[PDB]
Ligand binder design. Structure first.
Ligand SMILES: *[C@@H]1O[C@H](CO)[C@@H](O[C@@H]2O[C@H](CO)[C@@H](O[C@@H]3O[C@H](CO[C@H]4O[C@H](CO)[C@@H](O)[C@H](O)[C@@H]4O)[C@@H](O)[C@H](O[C@H]4O[C@H](CO)[C@@H](O)[C@H](O)[C@@H]4O)[C@@H]3O)[C@H](O)[C@H]2NC(C)=O)[C@H](O)[C@H]1NC(C)=O
Ligand SMILES: *[C@@H]1O[C@H](CO)[C@@H](O[C@@H]2O[C@H](CO)[C@@H](O[C@@H]3O[C@H](CO[C@H]4O[C@H](CO)[C@@H](O)[C@H](O)[C@@H]4O)[C@@H](O)[C@H](O[C@H]4O[C@H](CO)[C@@H](O)[C@H](O)[C@@H]4O)[C@@H]3O)[C@H](O)[C@H]2NC(C)=O)[C@H](O)[C@H]1NC(C)=O
Ligand SMILES: *[C@@H]1O[C@H](CO)[C@@H](O[C@@H]2O[C@H](CO)[C@@H](O)[C@H](O)[C@H]2NC(C)=O)[C@H](O)[C@H]1NC(C)=O
Ligand SMILES: *[C@@H]1O[C@H](CO)[C@@H](O[C@@H]2O[C@H](CO)[C@@H](O)[C@H](O)[C@H]2NC(C)=O)[C@H](O)[C@H]1NC(C)=O
Ligand SMILES: *[C@@H]1O[C@H](CO)[C@@H](O)[C@H](O)[C@H]1NC(C)=O
Ligand SMILES: *[C@@H]1O[C@H](CO)[C@@H](O)[C@H](O)[C@H]1NC(C)=O
Ligand SMILES: *[C@@H]1O[C@H](CO)[C@@H](O)[C@H](O)[C@H]1NC(C)=O
Ligand SMILES: *[C@@H]1O[C@H](CO)[C@@H](O)[C@H](O)[C@H]1NC(C)=O
Lengths: 410, 409
C-alpha cells in the first residue's frame, strides 16, 4: 500500500528506488560524423605490433550512422552500440555535451563504456537550474596545472567537502575500448558516512541539468588516421529528488516529471510544504524523525494560516501556526473564541460549525446586549438573576415597567 | 437509441409498451376442487332441450386438476385451460381472489373468460399499498341497493370522477361457457380526453395489489354440484414509470422496478434522484416531460437540498442548493470564496484550488481581510494596490513597523 507510513501508519521515509538516471533520453551535442560523410581509422594490435583498419560514416547510412541513441539504448556486450563524433577534433575546442532534465536529481554511480580509448584531460559539469547557469563537478588530468591550473590528487578538506580533485590515475590506455570509469562522488568524503546529516553535501548532490565538455586527448607515434570520439553506452545512477516525500515521480499537466509529494509537502521536488501546512517549518523526513509538514488548527473555522519564526522559537520548538479569517463568528489562532457580538455555544463541540451564537440576552431583564462569551451570563441588572437575566431574585418582584422589572422586597 | 431521448437526444418521455401482466404469475386463493377430490356438474344446451353432464376434480390428478395456472397460461382457443373451484359453495361467502404485485401500474381494460356460466354477484378490490389496505370499484349485480347499498348505472360526475357506479350488464347466461366480460375504466368519464392533465384520473389508475370477491351464481333449473370456472386470464398494462423510464428492470433484491431515466428516482420514477432537486419532481406530460434536474454546485459539493419558495420566487425557474462546501468553496453553489481566501480571476471558476488567499501586507495592509472579490487589502492612509504594497501618489515610504507611507509636499 503506502511505504510513506510505518506499520502503524507512522510517517516514514518513502523513496524512489535506485535507477539509472540516463535511460532512453535525448542529449544535445556539438558535432558528429557523417555530415559531411566522414571517415575514421581504427588500429588493432596483435602480439607485438599493430594493424589499422579504417571506415566511413554516413548518418543517412543507418548501420554506418552512429547516433547517441547507441548510448541510451541497452548495452549488449555482444552487439555493441558505438556512437561516433566527427573526426579530427581536439584541444583547444569545447567537445561539449548538454543535458536539461527538468527535475532536480542526485547521482551515486557515474559509469561509462568505451568504443574509443580513454582521453587524458576532461572535466565534469552540472546545473542546478534548467540550462541557464552551469558549474563544474570534478577534474581529471595528468597536467592538472599547465592545462587546468590545478593540483594533482589534492585533499578533501572538511571545511570545503565540496573540493574538486584532479588526478592522472585511470586516465590510461589500455583501455583502448570498453574503458570503465566509475566515478563515485561518495569516495573520499570523511563525513560521507553520515550524509543524511550533510546538507552542504545534500546540496552537492543537487543537480538539474548536466553538461560535459572535452578538449584534450592522448597522442602516440610518431590523414593517415581519422581520429574521432566514440562511446558504446551510458549508465548513471540516482533517485528522484522528493526530499523523502514521494516513492516515485510522475508527469505534470504540462508534461513535466513531478513528485506526488507526500508528508504534507508540495512542489515538483517536495521542496515546499503543502498549502495550509504552515505550522512547523519545512524539513525533510528523517529515518529517526518524521519531519513531515503539518497543517494549522482552525477548529473547523478557517482554511488559511501563516507562520512567524518567534512563535516556533518561543514555543519551545513545538508549533507556530495561526489561522486567518475565522468563520462561524469565531476568532483566534485556532478560531477558538467568538468575537464581539456572539458567544460560545458551550453545548456544541469545541470545533462545531455553529459553536458561536449571538447573545440572546433579555432585552429588558439584561442590561446590555453582550453576554459573557465565556459563560453566557447576560448583563443582569441590580436585582436581576438568571443566565440570560430573565428571572427575578429572591425577594424581587417582576414589574410591568419596561425599564425596572425586578424590585427588592423588605 | 434510448427512447428516453429524442431524435436529437432530447430526454423525451419513454414508456414501457402495453403488455399482459398476469401471464405466468402465482396466486394464493381460498379453495378449489381437488381438496378433497370434488365433483361438479356441467349442463349443455343441445339446440333446444336440456342435457347436464357432471365431472370430478383431483388436484393430485394432473389432467383432472384445475390449477390457477389455467388462468395464467396462454389460452389456446382450441385447448382451453379451465380452472375450477370447489363446489357446494355460494353467497354468502367471500369467494375472494387476491394478488400482491410489488410494482405500481396503470391499467385501462379488464377482460374475463369462462368455462362455467357467468354468475350474478362479484366484486373488485385493489391496494395502492402492498396488500394491506383495500378499495373497490364499480359494481355488478341486479340489486345494487339491496346488496351493495348502491345505485344501478350511476352517472360519472366530473366533480367526482372517483364515482363508483353499479350495473347489471353482461351478467347473463348465455354465455353458460366462454363468457366474455370487457371493462373500460375511462368509459363514462367526461374528463378522460385529458388524462395527462387529469391527476385524479392519474390517481384513479393507481393500482398495486388487486383483490376480487365472488358470492352469487344463478340457479337456472333449479341435485347439482355448483361451482365457478374460467379458461384463462389476460391483463395488459405498462409499468408505472411516470413517463420517465422506458421499462422496469429487476432489482438486486428481486424487484421489477423502473430504470428511471430523465433524472427521476423511486421504483416508479415518482421522485427525483439524489442531487436531482433543482426543481421538484413532476410527471412527464404530453406537453412537457417535466423531468428532474440536478443541483448546481460548480464542482464544489457532494450533497444538496431545495426549497419551493426559491422556485416560487424564481418565477418558476430553479432552486437547487449545495451542502458541505469543501476545497476552499462556499455558497449556494459553493460558488464564492468564504470569509477567507479571494478570487484568483486567472484560474477557472471551479478549480479545486480556485480560491486564493488574501495575501494582505502584514504591515502595508491594515486588516487581514482583502476585498475577496477585488482582493483589495486594507491599504492604510497612503497605501494603494490590491494587497496594499505600494504607496499612493504623494506618499513617502518608511521602514516603520507601522506606518510606511508618509505624505509629501
Ligand atoms: C549516405 O549513406 C547512405 C547509405 O550508405 C546513402 O544512401 C543512399 O541514398 C540514396 C538516396 O538518393 C539511394 O540511392 C538509390 O540508388 C540510385 C542509383 O541511381 C539509379 O537510380 C535508379 C535505380 O534506383 C535508376 O533508374 C537510375 O537511372 C540510376 O541509375 C539513386 O539514383 C537513387 O537516389 C535518388 O533518390 C532520391 C530520393 O530518394 C532522389 O531525390 C534523387 O533523384 C536520387 O538520385 C536511389 O534512391 C540509396 O538509398 C542509397 N544509395 C547507396 C547506399 O548506394 C547515401 O547516398 C549517403 N549520402 C550521400 C550524400 O551519398
Ligand atoms: C388423484 O389423482 C391422481 C392422478 O390420477 C391419483 O394418483 C394415483 O397415484 C398413486 C400413487 O401411488 C398410484 O398408485 C399406483 O397403483 C398401485 C396399486 O397398488 C398395487 O401396487 C402394485 C402394482 O403397482 C402391486 O404389487 C400391489 O400389490 C398393489 O396391488 C399403488 O399401490 C402404487 O402406489 C404405491 O406407490 C407409492 C410410491 O409411488 C408407495 O409409496 C405406496 O406404497 C403406494 O401404495 C402405484 O403408484 C395410482 O396409479 C394413481 N391413480 C391414478 C393415476 O388414477 C390419485 O389416486 C387420485 N386420488 C385419489 C384419492 O384417487
Ligand atoms: C568554448 O568555451 C565556452 C564553453 O565551453 C564558450 O563560452 C563563450 O564565451 C564567450 C566569451 O565572450 C561568449 O561570448 C560566448 O557567448 C560563450 N558561449 C556560449 C555562452 O555558448 C565558447 O563559446 C566555446 N566556444 C565554442 C563552443 O566554439
Ligand atoms: C368476508 O368479508 C371480509 C373480507 O372480504 C372479512 O372482514 C373481516 O371483518 C372482521 C370484523 O370483526 C375482522 O375481524 C376480520 O379481520 C376481517 N377479515 C379480513 C379483513 O380479512 C370477513 O371476515 C370475510 N368473511 C370470511 C372470510 O368468512
Ligand atoms: C546487431 O544488431 C543490428 C540491428 O539490426 C544488426 O543489424 C546487426 O547485424 C547485429 N550484429 C550482428 C553481428 O549481427
Ligand atoms: C465569565 O464567567 C467566568 C466564570 O467564573 C468569570 O470568571 C469571568 O470573570 C466572567 N467574565 C468574563 C470572562 O468576561
Ligand atoms: C391440451 O393440452 C394438454 C397438455 O398436457 C393435453 O393433455 C390435452 O390432451 C390437450 N387437449 C386438447 C383438446 O388439445
Ligand atoms: C471592492 O472592490 C470594488 C471594485 O471597485 C469596489 O467598488 C468596492 O468598494 C470594494 N469594497 C467592498 C466591495 O467592500
Amino acid at each position: 500500500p503506502d511505504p510513506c507510513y510505518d506499520e502503524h501508519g507512522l510517517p516514514r521515509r518513502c523513496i524512489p528506488d535506485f535507477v539509472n538516471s540516463a535511460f532512453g533520453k535525448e542529449v544535445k551535442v556539438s558535432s558528429t560524423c557523417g555530415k559531411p560523410p566522414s571517415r575514421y581509422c581504427v588500429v588493432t594490435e596483435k602480439g607485438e605490433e599493430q594493424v589499422r583498419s579504417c571506415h566511413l560514416c554516413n548518418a543517412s547510412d543507418p548501420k554506418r550512422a552512429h547516433p547517441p541513441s547507441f548510448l541510451t539504448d541497452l548495452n549488449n556486450p555482444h552487439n555493441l552500440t558505438c556512437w561516433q563524433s566527427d573526426s579530427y577534433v581536439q584541444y583547444p575546442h569545447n567537445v561539449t555535451l548538454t543535458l536539461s532534465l527538468g527535475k532536480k536529481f542526485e547521482v551515486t554511480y557515474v559509469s561509462l563504456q568505451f568504443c574509443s580509448p580513454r582521453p587524458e584531460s576532461m572535466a565534469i559539469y552540472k546545473s542546478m537550474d534548467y540550462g541557464k547557469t552551469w558549474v563544474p563537478f570534478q577534474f581529471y588530468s595528468t597536467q592538472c596545472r599547465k592545462m587546468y591550473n590545478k593540483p594533482s590528487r589534492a585533499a578533501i578538506t572538511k571545511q570545503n567537502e565540496q573540493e574538486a580533485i584532479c588526478t592522472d590515475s585511470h586516465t590510461d590506455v589500455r583501455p583502448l575500448s570498453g574503458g570503465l570509469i566509475a566515478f563515485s562522488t561518495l569516495d573520499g568524503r570523511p563525513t560521507a558516512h553520515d550524509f543524511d546529516n550533510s546538507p552542504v553535501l545534500q546540496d552537492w548532490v543537487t543537480a538539474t541539468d548536466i553538461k560535459v565538455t572535452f578538449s584534450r586527448l592522448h597522442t602516440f607515434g610518431d590523414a593517415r588516421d581519422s581520429y574521432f570520439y566514440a562511446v558504446s553506452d551510458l549508465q548513471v545512477g540516482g533517485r528522484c529528488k522528493c526530499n523523502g516525500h514521494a516513492s516515485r515521480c510522475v508527469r505534470d499537466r504540462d508534461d513535466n516529471l513531478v513528485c506526488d509529494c507526500k508528508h504534507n509537502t508540495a512542489g515538483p521536488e517536495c521542496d515546499r510544504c503543502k498549502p495550509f501546512h504552515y505550522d512547523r517549518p519545512w524539513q525533510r523526513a528523517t529515518a529517526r524523525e518524521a519531519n513531515e509538514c503539518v497543517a494549522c488548527n482552525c477548529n473547523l473555522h478557517a482554511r488559511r494560516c501563516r507562520f512567524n519564526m518567534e512563535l516556533y522559537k518561543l514555543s519551545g520548538r513545538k508549533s507556530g501556526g495561526v489561522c486567518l479569517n475565522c468563520r462561524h463568528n469565531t476568532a483566534g489562532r485556532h478560531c477558538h473564541y467568538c468575537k464581539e457580538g456572539f458567544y460560545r455555544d458551550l453545548s456544541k463541540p469545541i470545533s462545531h460549525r455553529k459553536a458561536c451564537k449571538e447573545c440572546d440576552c433579555h432585552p429588558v431583564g439584561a442590561a446590555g446586549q453582550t453576554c459573557n462569551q465565556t459563560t453566557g451570563q447576560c448583563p443582569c441588572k441590580d436585582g436581576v438573576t438568571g443566565i440570560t437575566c430573565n428571572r427575578c431574585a429572591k425577594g424581587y418582584q417582576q414589574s410591568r415597567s419596561p425599564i425596572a422589572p425586578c424590585i427588592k422586597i423588605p
